[PDB]
């Protein structure tokens, strides 16, 4: 009935069929926000999954709407193996328990696994 509206802060190219493409400045209305870090959004003549990372809102552009860290950590387990790609990312194996310390909206959460701390995809994690 009254959809939130956001503004693309960079160009995005579709990698998959479900995705939508962006060009900087595009103004989208947001249909669904997934903790995955992918948001379903509509334009004129276009609708698809968009990385939330690539959006400012049209409200208070520089203020974050991310949660804030919980350095006590919260219990999660990996549902699917992921290999680190960047240096700040954490490789896990399916089934490993971790502690989530920051549920960033972008889909790349901060986690602690014993003596390694870093970024990991929220889509590949689950609660316990």
């Amino acid at each position: 009935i009254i959809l939130q509206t956001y503004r693309a802060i960079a160009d995005y190219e579709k990698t998959s069929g479900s995705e939508m493409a962006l060009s900087t400045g595009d103004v989208v209305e947001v249909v669904e926000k997934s903790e995955s870090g992918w948001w379903f959004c509509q334009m004129k003549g276009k609708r698809g999954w968009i990385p939330a990372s690539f959006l400012e809102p049209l409200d208070s552009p520089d203020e974050t709407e991310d949660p804030e860290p919980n350095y006590a950590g919260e219990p999660y387990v990996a549902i699917k193996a992921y290999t680190a790609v960047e240096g700040d990312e954490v490789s896990l194996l399916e089934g490993e328990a971790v502690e989530v310390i920051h549920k960033l909206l972008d889909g790349w959460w901060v986690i602690r696994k014993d003596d390694v701390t870093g970024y990991f995809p929220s889509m590949y994690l689950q609660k316990s």
Partner: peptide, 11 residues
């Protein structure tokens, strides 16, 4: 949604 995670943030 897509089965791969999205990309890391840019800019």
């Amino acid at each position: 949604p897509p089965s791969n995670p999205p990309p890391r943030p840019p800019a």
